[PDB]
Each structure stands twice: as structure tokens, then as C-alpha cells.
């Protein structure tokens, strides 16, 4: 029994051990209550404004589109405190934890950005934070690991399975299954068991709300399309949500194509995986023929979640949103192009969304189109990755 629908069509659900069902029910109740509570809303809005720096800018990128009939705006989540959109929903989830009377936070992280966001929210709001991170990720993400530790979080390496994000996800749930009486699991994307896909969407929806207000102000009309990269689906659903009922607005999600779909070395389960049940949900995922869960590959460390939020799978199924992929090489070119032509260093994650927008423009340069790309994060973290690639060129 639930207050809200745990499914988006066939996708989603609450595939957790029985022991965790009261924790999910408790969280759903707290969320539904919070959503109706003007005081909760005001506290959340206050943190977003005065701590995180909302609203974020909407930047018109004229140099990139010169000589075409594309108008391109970037929604500047790269300017949010922490350098990525993840900060929005961790502040909301931290406030839910407090609402439920919890003083401890568990979080998973792959490339480290969600861990950092969880750690900063926990430092601000007086919560004890423990972060699970696959040991291979710990090894390759020393900057983010150090940031988490500076902000007082305990970072716990996970050595089981593939020692990457999925293994950290499992470990977070194992911990929660024994600790839910005192700890809240601050899940890092719009995926996992209900109510998390719903909560994360609602705590990211200011992205699209602001974009709508800003584009109306500047252009006097809605965008022709909004474009966002899709790791687990949080930044994309945050951009899409307020436009879902505006049927003229295209919603385009960009999964990582890695070395190319045909190589199998990618992270595009929505369009190129197979529906499975894992991490509490029924959703497309990266899996072997036998049903063992596999990793997602991308040049961008942050698009490593091996499944996708169930609401994206649903929006795809009904044809409301379209999903495409962008290769490592395409993302790298978009990264370089933005740096050089606009003076903005984008996250390699976000560069996937930009790459697709650039393709829309370049393929059909006389097509009149007003596009918004969600610039989910800044790319300071990626400059050596890009250096080492261009050093071998």
C-alpha cells in the first residue's frame, strides 16, 4: 500500500527486501507531508536561494550558433554551489531526513559528485554522513574523496563485485536495511525504489520551472526542445518535468554512447539495454545475457549508473520524450567548442547534451529552432582527462 503510484507505466516499483518496505513507506509519507507544508517549502527555497545560489542563469550562446537558425540557451547548473545540479535534491533530501527525525545520512557515489553534494548538505545541516564508493572509484577520484573528507563525511570503500558504483549502491542498501531507524538513504539520482524517482524529480524540478520563466522572459515563447544528458536521470527529469504538459516542447535525453553503440562499450541502457529488476526498480539496464548486472562505460565518469530512472523509460515508451546517444569523441568536441567559443568549461557529462544540440544545429542549419541545453555541471574536474586525450593527438 502506498500514497503515490510507484510505477510509471510498467517501469519502477519497490523491489527491495521486505525489511526495507517500512523505510520506503515512512519516506513516502514524510515526502507527501513535506510537499504540503509551506514551512518546509520556505526552508527549502531559502537554502536553494541563499546557500546554493538559485536561480541559476540562462545564458544565450551566440558564438556557437552564428550563421545558423538555431538559438541556443544553456541552463547554468554549473553555477550552482558544488558545481553541479546534484546540490538541489540533496538539500531537499537532507530536510526530509530532519523532518523524519534522522541525524545520519548514507549515500552512494560513483565519480564522487553525489558524495560531495551529500557531504556538503550534511555539513551544513548537522547530519553525520557516510558515503559508499567502489574501491576502483576511490582510487581514481582522489579529489572528490578528499573533498568529502574535508567536509567531515566518512568515505567507505566497497571492494565487493566490480568495486564501482553499482557495488556502492548495493552496500548503501545493505547498510540501510539495518540502520533505517536512525539513518536516511540519500539516493543520488531519479532511480531506485519508489519513492525516490518521484522525490528526486520534485527536488530537481526548479531547473525546468526557472528555464520556462527565463525563456518566456527573453524569447516570449516556450523552447522548441530541452536537451539533457542522462546518467540515472536526475538533471534531465528536473529540466523536463515542468514541460511535460507543454506538448509542443521536445524533450531530448542523451545517454553516453562511449566508444560507439556497436562496440558494446557504452552507457545507453534506455535505448540499447534490456529491462531488468535491480536496485529496487524495474527499468532498462546494462546486463549480461544471463542477467548479471554490468557497468556503464563513458569517457564521463558521472554517466556511470548502469540503468536509468523509470520515468524516463516511461516517457520514452509513450513517445513523450526522445532518447539518443553521443559518443566520447562527440562529447569531447562539444567540450572544446564551448570552452573556446563561449568561455564556459562544461562537465563532460553535460557535454553530451551540448554535443547533441550542436548536431541538431549542424545537420539542419537553416531549421529555425530554439533550444535549451541543461548544463548540468562545470568541467574543471575534466580538464586533465581532456588534456591526456588531446596529448595523445
Amino acid at each position: 500500500t502506498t500514497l503515490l503510484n510507484p510505477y510509471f507505466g510498467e517501469f519502477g516499483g519497490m523491489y527491495v527486501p521486505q525489511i526495507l518496505m517500512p523505510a520506503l513507506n515512512q519516506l513516502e509519507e514524510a515526502f507527501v507531508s513535506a510537499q504540503k507544508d509551506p514551512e518546509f517549502q520556505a526552508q527549502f527555497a531559502d537554502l536553494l536561494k541563499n546557500y546554493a545560489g538559485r536561480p541559476t542563469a540562462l545564458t544565450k550562446c551566440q558564438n556557437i550558433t552564428a550563421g545558423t537558425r538555431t538559438t541556443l540557451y544553456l541552463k547554468r547548473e554549473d553555477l550552482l554551489h558544488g558545481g553541479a545540479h546534484k546540490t538541489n535534491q540533496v538539500l531537499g533530501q537532507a530536510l526530509l531526513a530532519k523532518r523524519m527525525g534522522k541525524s545520519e545520512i548514507i549515500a552512494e557515489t560513483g565519480a564522487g559528485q553525489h558524495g560531495v553534494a551529500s557531504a556538503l548538505a550534511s555539513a551544513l545541516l548537522g547530519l553525520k554522513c557516510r558515503i559508499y564508493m567502489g574501491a576502483k572509484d576511490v582510487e581514481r577520484q582522489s579529489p572528490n574523496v578528499f573533498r568529502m573528507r574535508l567536509m567531515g563525511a566518512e568515505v567507505i570503500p566497497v571492494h565487493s563485485g566490480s568495486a564501482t558504483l553499482k557495488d556502492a549502491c548495493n552496500e548503501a542498501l545493505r547498510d540501510w536495511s539495518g540502520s533505517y531507524e536512525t539513518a536516511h538513504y540519500m539516493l543520488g539520482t531519479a532511480a531506485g525504489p519508489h519513492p525516490y524517482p518521484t522525490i528526486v524529480r520534485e527536488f530537481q524540478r526548479m531547473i525546468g520551472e526557472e528555464t520556462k520563466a527565463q525563456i518566456l522572459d527573453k524569447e516570449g515563447r516556450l523552447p522548441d526542445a530541452v536537451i539533457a544528458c542522462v546518467g540515472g536521470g536526475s538533471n534531465a527529469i528536473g529540466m523536463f518535468a515542468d514541460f511535460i504538459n507543454d506538448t509542443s516542447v521536445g524533450l531530448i535525453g542523451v545517454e553516453p554512447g562511449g566508444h560507439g553503440i556497436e562496440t558494446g562499450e557504452h552507457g545507453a541502457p534506455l535505448k540499447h539495454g534490456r529491462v531488468g529488476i535491480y536496485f529496487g526498480m524495474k527499468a532498462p539496464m546494462m546486463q549480461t545475457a544471463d542477467g548479471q548486472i554490468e557497468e556503464s562505460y563513458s569517457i564521463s565518469a558521472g554517466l556511470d549508473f548502469p540503468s536509468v530512472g523509470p520515468q524516463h523509460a516511461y516517457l520514452n515508451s509513450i513517445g513523450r520524450a526522445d532518447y539518443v546517444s553521443i559518443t566520447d569523441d562527440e562529447a569531447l568536441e562539444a567540450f572544446k567548442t564551448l570552452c573556446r567559443h563561449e568561455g564556459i568549461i562544461p562537465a563532460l557529462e553535460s557535454s553530451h547534451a551540448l554535443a547533441h544540440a550542436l548536431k541538431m544545429m549542424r545537420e539542419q542549419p537553416e531549421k529555425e529552432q530554439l533550444l535549451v541545453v541543461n548544463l548540468s555541471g562545470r568541467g574543471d574536474k575534466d580538464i586533465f582527462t581532456v588534456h591526456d586525450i588531446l596529448k595523445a593527438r
Binding site: 523491489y15 527491495v16 527486501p17 521486505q18 518496505m21 548495493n170 542498501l173 539495518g178 542477467g291 548479471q292
Partner: protein, 268 residues
């Protein structure tokens, strides 16, 4: 078939509890796993719980995480597990065989097809660890269509609605969780809540087996005295495998000694 019903009737006749070990199929290899299982049976196991290696066993603590990893190191696949299961049944016609599954392995090639394969190899029950009663409908329906008992979990804090659901929907046995958290011998659970055992009987549930953290004879005895039909032990068994990887002979000897002791604790 009616293997659990028959077992419980026979144990009842003898005022006896069930002792049910868990191991991971194919840990530490197929041939050794088969010998392990034959040893468990010879030493007095009343039924078996058998894990199919899964990449992401999110209800399992380190001991069983490591068992899954050892099976994978030996190249163990679900197909090979079904081959093992068929042979186990061919050797041992009456012992109840339960699988511990994760949802993706059941859903992968189709839920109905999974349960049909279980029936073909002579499995008696399936416990899907990450499917709560709320999500159970297609699993329990397929189970019953193929003469497989779907096993449900009764947590310590189960309310009346959940007890009634577990009682109605389950078959074979009811899994009585000793505590919250994940599998592991390092974390002892509670005495079976007498209230829970009594409500399950009131609601005509399948007989209860207590599991999680059962590592000692005293706990087996206590479970049965509290009114459970028996007890399941996994990590304590798997630890003997882990400890004795370098000596298959000592491994079997210690498994035999341990199972013998645990089964003795279940006797009147």
C-alpha cells in the same frame, strides 16, 4: 510435489525441528559444491537453501558476498546451477530444495520460464530476496502454476496486515527473519517473537523457519522451543568453506561436524 509438507509431517511425528543449511551453488567450484551438498545431507540437513550466484546480492553480508564471488571465479552460471540442481534431485528424492534468488535472475528470461525450469529440475521453493509481498504477484502466481512454493519473509516488526499476507500467499515454509540487516553470522538475531509465531499459526501460514545470524546449536534449539518448525544457517556454513579452501578434505570434515551438531540441537 509436497516435499515440505511431507518433511514437516515427519518431523512433527518425531517432535523434531528442521535444520536447513544455505550454501551458494558452485562455491568454490561445481564439483566441490556437489560434494559439499552431499556432505550437508549425509550429516543430517533436513532441507537445503541454495543460492544462484548473482552479481549484486544486496541482502547478503560479506561472507555470502564472497561465496558469490568465488562461484563467479569458477565461471558458474545460472545454466550450470540448474544442471547441478537436477543432479542433486536425482540423488536425493525427498529432501526439500529451496532456491535463494534475486529478482533479475528470475525475470531475465521470463518469470514463467524460470519457474518452469525449477519444476523441471525438481526444486521445491523459491525465495526472491528483493521482491516484497507488495511486488510478489507475478512471482507467486508463476511459482504456484509450476508447483513451486513461493517463500515470503516475515520481519520481526510485521504488522497484522503483513502477517495475513505472508500467511495467505506463501507456501512450503514461512521465513521468519531474526532481525533487520543482511545475512551474517557476526550479527545474532532475536528469539523468534512468540507473538509472530502464534499469529502465523492462527492464520494457517506455512510452518516457520527462523533465519539470519543462526550460527550455534543453542540458537537452533531456541528457535524450535519458541515454536518455529526449524532454523536456517548460511554464513556459519559458508565460513567453513571459506576457511578451508586450501583443504577440501578438512572442509568436508568440518562441515560434517558442524551440521551434525546443528541438527542434533533440533531433536527432541
Amino acid at each position: 510435489m509436497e516435499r515440505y509438507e511431507n518433511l514437516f509431517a515427519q518431523l512433527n511425528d518425531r517432535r523434531e525441528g528442521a535444520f536447513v543449511p544455505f550454501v551458494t551453488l558452485g562455491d568454490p567450484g561445481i564439483e566441490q559444491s556437489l560434494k559439499i551438498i552431499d556432505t550437508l545431507i549425509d550429516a543430517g540437513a533436513d532441507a537445503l537453501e541454495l543460492g544462484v550466484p548473482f552479481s549484486d546480492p544486496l541482502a547478503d553480508g560479506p561472507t555470502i558476498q564472497n561465496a558469490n564471488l568465488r562461484a563467479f571465479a569458477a565461471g558458474v552460471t545460472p545454466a550450470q546451477c540448474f544442471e547441478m540442481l537436477a543432479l542433486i534431485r536425482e540423488k536425493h528424492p525427498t529432501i526439500p530444495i529451496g532456491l535463494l534468488m534475486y529478482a533479475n535472475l528470475v525475470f531475465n528470461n521470463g518469470i514463467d520460464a524460470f519457474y518452469a525450469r525449477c519444476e523441471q529440475v525438481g526444486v521445491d521453493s523459491v525465495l526472491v530476496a528483493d521482491v516484497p509481498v507488495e511486488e510478489s504477484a507475478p512471482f507467486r502466481q508463476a511459482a504456484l502454476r509450476h508447483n513451486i512454493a513461493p517463500i515470503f519473509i516475515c520481519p520481526p516488526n510485521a504488522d497484522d496486515d503483513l502477517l495475513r499476507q505472508v500467511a495467505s500467499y506463501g507456501r512450503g515454509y514461512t521465513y521468519l527473519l531474526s532481525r533487520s540487516g543482511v545475512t551474517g553470522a557476526e550479527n545474532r538475531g532475536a528469539l523468534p517473537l512468540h507473538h509472530l509465531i502464534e499469529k502465523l499459526k492462527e492464520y494457517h501460514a506455512a510452518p516457520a523457519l527462523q533465519g539470519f545470524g543462526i550460527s550455534s546449536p543453542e540458537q537452533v534449539s531456541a528457535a524450535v522451543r519458541a515454536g518455529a518448525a526449524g532454523a536456517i544457517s548460511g554464513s556459519a556454513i559458508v565460513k567453513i568453506i571459506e576457511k578451508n579452501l586450501a583443504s577440501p578434505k578438512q572442509m568436508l570434515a568440518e562441515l560434517r561436524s558442524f551440521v551434525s551438531a546443528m541438527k542434533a540441537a533440533s531433536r527432541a
